[PDB]
Amino acid sequence: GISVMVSRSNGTVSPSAFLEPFSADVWVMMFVMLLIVSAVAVFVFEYFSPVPSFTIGKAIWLLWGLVFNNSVPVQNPKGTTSKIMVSVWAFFAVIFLASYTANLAAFMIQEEYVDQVSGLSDKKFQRPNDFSPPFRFGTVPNGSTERNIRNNYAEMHAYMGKFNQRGVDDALLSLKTGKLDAFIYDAAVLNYMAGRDEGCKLVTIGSGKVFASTGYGIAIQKDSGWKRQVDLAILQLFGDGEMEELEALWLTGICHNEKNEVMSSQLDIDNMAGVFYMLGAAMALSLITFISEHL
Amino acid sequence: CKGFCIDILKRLAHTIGFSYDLYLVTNGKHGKKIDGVWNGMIGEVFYQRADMAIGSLTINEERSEIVDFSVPFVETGISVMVARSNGTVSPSAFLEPYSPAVWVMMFVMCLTVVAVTVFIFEYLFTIGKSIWLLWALVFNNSVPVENPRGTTSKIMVLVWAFFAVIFLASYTANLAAFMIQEEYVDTVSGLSDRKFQRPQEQYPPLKFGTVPNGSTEKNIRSNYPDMHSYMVRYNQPRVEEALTQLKAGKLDAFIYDAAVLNYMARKDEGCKLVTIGSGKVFATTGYGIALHKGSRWKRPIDLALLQFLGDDEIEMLERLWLSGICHEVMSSKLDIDNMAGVFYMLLVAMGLSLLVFAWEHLVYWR
Amino acid sequence: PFQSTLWLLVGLSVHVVAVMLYLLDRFSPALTLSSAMWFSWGVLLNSGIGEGAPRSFSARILGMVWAGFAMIIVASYTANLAAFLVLDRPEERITGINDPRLRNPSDKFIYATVKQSSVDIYFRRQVELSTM
Amino acid sequence: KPTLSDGTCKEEFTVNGDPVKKVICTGPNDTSPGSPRHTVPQCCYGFCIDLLIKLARTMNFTYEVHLVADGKFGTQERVNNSNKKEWNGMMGELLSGQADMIVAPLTINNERAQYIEFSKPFKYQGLTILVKKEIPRSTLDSFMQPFQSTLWLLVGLSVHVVAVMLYLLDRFSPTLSSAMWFSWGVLLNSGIGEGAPRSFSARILGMVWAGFAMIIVASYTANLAAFLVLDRPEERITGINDPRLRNPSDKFIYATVKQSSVDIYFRRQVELSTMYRHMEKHNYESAAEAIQAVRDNKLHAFIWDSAVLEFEASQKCDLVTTGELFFRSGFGIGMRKDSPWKQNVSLSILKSHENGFMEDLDKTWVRYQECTLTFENMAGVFMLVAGGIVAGIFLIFIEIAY
Amino acid sequence: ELFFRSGFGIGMRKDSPWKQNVSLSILKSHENGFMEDLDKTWVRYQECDSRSNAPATLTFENMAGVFMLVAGGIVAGIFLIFIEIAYKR
Ligand SMILES: *[C@@H]1O[C@H](CO)[C@@H](O[C@@H]2O[C@H](CO)[C@@H](O)[C@H](O)[C@H]2NC(C)=O)[C@H](O)[C@H]1NC(C)=O
Ligand SMILES: *[C@@H]1O[C@H](CO)[C@@H](O)[C@H](O)[C@H]1NC(C)=O
Ligand SMILES: *[C@@H]1O[C@H](CO)[C@@H](O)[C@H](O)[C@H]1NC(C)=O
Ligand SMILES: *[C@@H]1O[C@H](CO)[C@@H](O)[C@H](O)[C@H]1NC(C)=O
Ligand SMILES: *[C@@H]1O[C@H](CO)[C@@H](O)[C@H](O)[C@H]1NC(C)=O
Ligand SMILES: N[C@@H](CCC(=O)O)C(=O)O
Ligand SMILES: N[C@@H](CCC(=O)O)C(=O)O
Q1: How far apart are CA D178 and CA D163, in angstroms?
Q2: Helix or strand or coil: residue D368?
Q3: Residue C110 gets which letter from DSSP?
Q4: So where does this one cross the membrane (chain C)?
């Protein structure tokens, strides 16, 4: 058919990767549990027991500083029954924090990467003159894979003129260098090249996706007499299983590009973008409360 | 009749040329001596009631003195098969995921810094109050500690605080990597273990047995007479009947030839039966075709069997017939035994504390 | 993550270590018995309650090793919980036509197709697969 | 090994304390490698020699050991004139009358089985491939793998900007030193400083800031606990039928030892003609030369006996074996067809298998040798401590002067 | 994995006048996107997802003992109050 090749080096990180553990319930409904224990301790456990002042404001600060690891200065209450309640809550923080780390490591062992393109109808191919420094793609001329594009997508055929390789061997070199980003060719060869490349640095878009399914064949002379006898011979090889052996002997590759397990990843600003914008809401959240605090 | 051995027989008759007529023997099995006579596939060849005895026959020394075998085509010995136990990990993994040099060098950095942060406090705090602080940051701030009062002494502990996070965060990462992928620890060794030779000297009486009237019993009787007398009470009349005993929990180990136990250990539902030694074989003697001691067919057969091994025709027959599924790690709870390594760390400290207590107490007297 | 027998031993080990901290410090040349108890729990549970601290040098070294046993037990807990979430995966499935369960079928396994179709013709002209 | 000046071999002892048994070997000094050489007595000892002394006592004969002249194992070569075929090496001296027995590792074949009679094998084995281990361990030299240099550029900027704001909201509501020490305390989790958010505005920003610190540490641990598991730079040959072997890529050089039995195995098959001709121009003369080539990266694979390659793997500890056995044929003592010792030799090998005698010869001569984070991968985390001490000292002199 | 690859096809009797133009309309339809459009509407509407490794998220029903522990201890201290004051009384 027709397939597209890419470099697989850049990939695409997954933003907002920290709120997947737990859900919108265990986060939100923990605050009310925080506010209940704090209110009960100050007004019942501490007030009605013997042994300067322990208001609600310092109590919520204390119980907030144990869930996020003991890091902030606090004040501890008095009385025997008050410390028992605080100690139990500290045993809830250990379980809550420990499971969060263990669960997060599970999601980053079995992560999945997405392609930068979806096919031959993506806007990067159809309209390349409206983006950042434009996408680079090209194909070897004088072939079937160029005649099909020239009839259906003549708008992008003109843009493909500048990028025009002169061989499959040469085009695979410029992909690793960076002179072009995509290579459009036939699917029976690009699959073999990707499966016989060291380091697994070349992959096919769509995990083996075709777009104009037309197989090979023998070009006999027109109105010949050998056509029927050849067809029955080819159809006989399929029945005996003599075609799979030939594929195993010649068309076998070693790279496991089918497996999507990315060999580790490095966190960057784009990857770690949600955490900073979580603080972004707090940049003006206190500033908004600054004006209302006067009244 | 069909099988792995029969496919060998058809090729030999095709590549050499002769006519045969198989017939099952009813007198015995595999051959045995009753002090004067032989019964089975060996006695018939010995008494000239047949010419060859193809099948699963083991090359021996007692048998090879009356009949002549051929080139072996399948390896075979003795092995022990036991039920798969719970996943066992090394208890010493509490301190293993590191190096002795890391902890040897761990305290040489602290000893220098504690002196520096105290000496620099003289210019504008005892040593005992310095070790109690800098060491405490390593295991997370959870113990009351004194703090300095200098605009530069606070800077040094910031550097130490940064190193504390890296050490703790990395330690819990290596431990997960070790407990995700690992290898199971074996339980028993082969026939030379102490549970077999003298089983009556341990509180749990190990239960094992084998099918009588074979070659894997004559081997045991003439080498380990002490073990043989104990196995008399534990005998089974069939291989499949003995396998249910392991499933039912009655027996603990089954001693049989390796070429059969390996097949039974692969063709299984759930694959909870394993062979001790990960494929350990004792007294290695392959199979063979018995002949008439003068059969004159020995040389053509041997050159025919050795020709198949030159090609890969025998290898194909192994893939077609002798192949199975689930030829690994287990999620096991920690339990006391696996975590018992770290409890010994505290035991030494309790004993060491008393000796230091006696040192201070006695020197104060004088 | 931990067996029920191991958790009860951790709780029992807190009192035993704490009880002789008071004995060790008092006899040697002052923290009350109840004040020592808050010290042991605070270290294990990471809570920030209490103020009592050991005074004797011999008493310090015991309450100092205990702060290392508290970190190991917590660290081992989160490493095992990362093994009950990523290691729950068995492996048993049919792999193509070359699977042993198909070449040599048993009575417990049953497979079939649709009568009078292309698959019937495929399984007749091949003589090696004459057993299924 | 060479003998002493006196003439007798050195007296050595085993680990248990049993002296080893040695004989006198009279072979060529260097097997004439382009230059003539005479024969000098030497010392021989090993698995097969220890087995030879057992047969002499049992069968009551006398022996004298001499090495092969050229040094090969045996194959059939054609004379230049006509097509007269004669054997060469250790296999061609048995038929010529210069030897009566061969106690050495000889694979039981079919070509040599038509001229001599072997015995029941005394060791079952197979063929396997040998490669060289690469990338001994992950480097991890810099601890900043999870967070690129861009992260630390602004994370350290984030603590300062949040610190100055903490001084602003509380002050102008119904200092710098107090605010700065509190901000760094949460990030690194150090119990220092007494500054607290007394005002309401400073509290709401401080509570959120505590959440940010926990997230950074949690992400750091998860990345390090996931990168270690997902570390697999696959380079294994996976035995035979690998695409890199059936179809050579002109950059993978693999060979074996001349003559021997691997050459016979590859020449008979016609589907292996495309790979036999590749290594026909790279075959070495001895196993010891091929092993050294692997270490020096002048060779990439080696096809030889499993019983030998699995002894060098546990000794060198720098190269490893990989693949699956694909030619099962044991060893065997070779004799002429008219020898009368054939039956007794074969009956004295089956008995030793079942007596446990051939387990002592395996423990003594084969199975005795078996070759985390550590200092490496964390040298960077050590220099910051020293750098902090050195940098801090200079500021102290200014502090004293201030 | 697939082990017998042979596609479909419109069957016609031998000596049929339509045997050429039927086989030329199919080739053109492949290259015009028509047969990659019938696949979209009739064969390729996803309805249920698959198992990409074992990703597990934690919900409230997963954490019952943890939250009932603090809720089960808030009443334990109330009983302690009635006996803590009893020490002075
Ligand atoms: C192989 O062993 C057999 C049996 O041990 C030997 O045959 C015996 O040889 C002794 C020698 O004098 C005779 O007295 C016996 O009568 C023989 N037969 C038996 C049954 O013992 C045979 O000689 C050995 N082979 C060689 C080459 O010596
Ligand atoms: C393609 O056709 C053009 C025009 O005929 C010719 O110049 C060129 O050499 C051909 N081949 C390639 C690879 O462009
Ligand atoms: C073994 O042989 C004895 C000989 O009498 C016989 O009684 C016994 O049943 C046999 N056991 C078997 C074949 O399992
Ligand atoms: C073994 O050899 C010795 C040496 O000549 C000789 O006495 C005889 O052949 C044998 N001795 C025995 C069988 O006692
Ligand atoms: C097929 O097309 C050709 C030209 O378009 C036409 O002449 C012919 O009649 C067509 N076939 C049939 C069966 O009508
Ligand atoms: N598979 C194509 C190669 C040429 C091309 O893709 O341009 C053909 O044979 O026509
Ligand atoms: N199958 C082997 C062993 C039988 C057994 O262990 O009883 C034989 O024929 O001798």
Answers
A1: 9
A2: coil
A3: -
A4: 4-24, 58-78
Distance of CA A112 to the CA centre of its chain: 5
Q: What is the largest CA-CA distance in chain B?
A: 111
Strands A182-185 and A137-138: parallel
Q: State the virtual CA torsion across E76, E81, E82, E83 in degrees, nearest 10.
A: 90
Strand partners, D77: D86
How do D301-305 and D127-130 pair as beta strands?
antiparallel
- Chain D contact partners (≥3 CB pairs within 8 A): A, B
Q: Report d(CA D303, CA D327) in Å as an integer.
A: 11
Resolution in angstroms comes to: 3.3
> Could you count the other beta carbons within 10 Å of the beta carbon of residue B71?
24
In degrees, to the nearest 5, what angle opens at C-alpha A53 toward C-alphas A51 and A55?
Answer: 120
Work out whether strand D39-44 and strand D23-28 pair parallel, antiparallel, or are unpaired: antiparallel
> Could you give the angle at which helices D380-401 and B153-180 cross, rounded to 10 degrees?
170
Per residue, the 3-state secondary structure of A31-90, as one string, reads: HHHHHHHHHHHHHHHCCCCCCCCCCHHHHHHHHHHHHCCCCCCCCCCCCHHHHHHHHHHH
Q: Distances in Å between the alpha carbon of A132 and those of A135, A136, A182?
A: 8, 12, 16
Q: Is D259 strand, coil or helix?
A: coil
Q: What is the greatest pairwise CA distance in chain E? A: 114
Way it was determined: cryo-EM
From the CA of C71, how many Å to the nearest CA of chain B?
Answer: 6
Of the candidates B327, B187, B201, the residue with the CA atom closest to the CA atom of residue B252: B187
Which of B77, D381, D307, A25 has the alpha carbon at shortest distance from E59?
A: A25
CB contact under 8 A, E70 and A44: no
* Closest to B343 in 3D by CA, of B331, B333, B335: B335
* H or E, element range at D297: none
- B275 vs B261: CA distance, rounded Å: 8
CA distance E16 to A56: 93
Tell me the residue type at A179: K
Rounded to a whole number of angstroms, the distance from the CA of C29 to the nearest CA of chain A is 30
Distance of CA B162 to the CA centre of its chain: 44
Strand partners, A267: D147
Residue A120 structure tokens: 């031959």
Report the C-alpha gap between B1 and E87 in whole angstroms: 91
Q: What is chain A's Cα-based Rg?
A: 32
d(CA B70, CA B184): 40
Nearest CB to A98; choose among C38, C74, C122: C74
- Which residue of E1, E4, E54 is in closest CB contact with C89? E54
Supply A101's token pair.
Answer: 């780390």
Lining residues, ligand 5, CB within 6 Å: E 17-18, 21
Ramachandran sector of residue A69 (left: φ over 0; alpha: ψ -120 to 50; beta: rest): left
Strand partners, B273: B83
DSSP helix/strand/coil, A244: helix
Between B140, B166, B282, which is nearest D143 by CB?
A: B166
Q: Are B210 and B235 in contact (CB under 8 A)?
A: yes
CA D232 to chain centre: 17
CB contact under 8 A, A69 and D222: no
Q: At what angle do helices B4-12 and B298-310 cross, to 10 degrees?
A: 110
Is B189 known to sit in a ligand binding site? no
Nearest CA to ligand 5 atom 8: E21
List C-alpha distances in Å: D305 to D125, D160, D260, D327: 7, 67, 11, 9
Q: What are phi and psi of D254, to 5 degrees?
A: -140, 140
For chain D, after which residues does the C atom lie more than 2.5 Å from the next written residue's N, i.e. where is it broken? 174, 371
Instruction: Write phi, then psi, for B159 (nearest 5 degrees).
Output: -65, -40
Q: Token digits for B81? A: 């098969």
What residues of chain C, 49 to 108, have a C-beta less than 8 Å from chain B? Answer: 50-51, 53, 56-73, 75-76, 78-80, 82-84, 86-88, 91-92, 99-101, 103-104
